[PDB]
Design an enzyme around this catalytic site. Structure first.
Site: not given
Ligand SMILES: O=C1Cc2ccc(Cl)cc2N1
Ligand SMILES: *[C@@H]1O[C@H](CO)[C@@H](O)[C@H](O)[C@H]1NC(C)=O
Ligand SMILES: [Zn+2]
Length: 217
Positions: A45, A89, A173
């Site tokens: 993503h 992902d 991410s």
């Molecule tokens: O570990 C993770 C990575 C990530 C990206 C975006 C959101 Cl809203 C929550 C989370 N939790």
């Protein structure tokens, strides 16, 4: 990274800081990790129109000789990545040239504790971090992630004690989840309020596809 500490600068020489370009909005940012001198692993993503990679960074706002800003020639997103289920992902980035090996930059070859690092936001309403932050998270039984309706034990790791605030978050991410020094997961998604656990891609499941992409390119 929520509830973490600032890394010792360059203590994680494989960490990659990703700046991603799309055509209809400003830049976005992810983490990732160097597994070959010219290959960086991250999340599907985090794909975009184009991507730049900075290796050797700690404080991402202050340029230094450790920095290697590298062009990405090609993006190999997993073909089956699903924007609905979030399955698979995972993405490989091919660097234009092979990175230089320095002290600051090098490749990385339930109930247990793993660690995850990133330049992502340090709280639900906090901006992304300037410096590389890390946090230690507990590997959970798959039933702890049941509420993520499309979570899949075979495909994913359930990571983070719900009694603790610690977590990866936006901007984190594509970062590796390391257990005993070895990469086991990749930051993928979680709740918007950051209440753990969160869902990480299970690297081992994708190992055939990873090796496939390396040898063909
Ligand atoms: O570990 C993770 C990575 C990530 C990206 C975006 C959101 Cl809203 C929550 C989370 N939790
Ligand atoms: C990072 O660098 C900028 C200046 O380049 C500085 O303003 C900021 O406070 C620094 N953060 C840390 C914790 O090093
Ligand atoms: Zn430095």
């Amino acid at each position: 990274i929520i509830g973490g500490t600032e890394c010792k600068p360059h203590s994680r020489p494989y960490m990659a800081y990703l700046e991603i370009v799309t055509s209809n909005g400003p830049s976005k940012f992810c983490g990732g990790f160097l597994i070959r001198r010219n290959f960086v692993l991250t999340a599907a993503h985090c794909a975009g129109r184009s991507i730049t990679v900075t290796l050797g960074a700690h404080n991402i706002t202050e340029e230094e000789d450790t920095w290697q800003k590298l062009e990405v020639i090609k993006q190999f997103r997993h073909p089956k990545y699903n924007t609905s289920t979030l399955h698979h992902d995972i993405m490989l980035l091919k660097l234009k040239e092979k990175a230089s090996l320095t002290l600051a930059v090098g490749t990385l070859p339930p109930g247990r504790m793993c660690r995850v690092a990133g330049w992502g936001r340090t709280g639900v309403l906090k901006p992304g971090s300037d410096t590389l932050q890390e946090v230690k998270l507990r590997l959970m039984d798959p039933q702890a992630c049941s509420h993520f309706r499309d979570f899949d034990h075979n495909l994913q790791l359930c990571v983070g004690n719900p009694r603790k605030t610690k977590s990866a978050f936006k901007g984190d991410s594509g970062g590796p989840l390391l257990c005993a020094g070895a990469a086991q997961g990749i930051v993928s998604y979680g709740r918007s309020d950051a209440k753990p656990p969160a869902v990480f891609t299970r690297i081992s499941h994708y190992q055939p596809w990873i090796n496939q992409i390396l040898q063909a390119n």
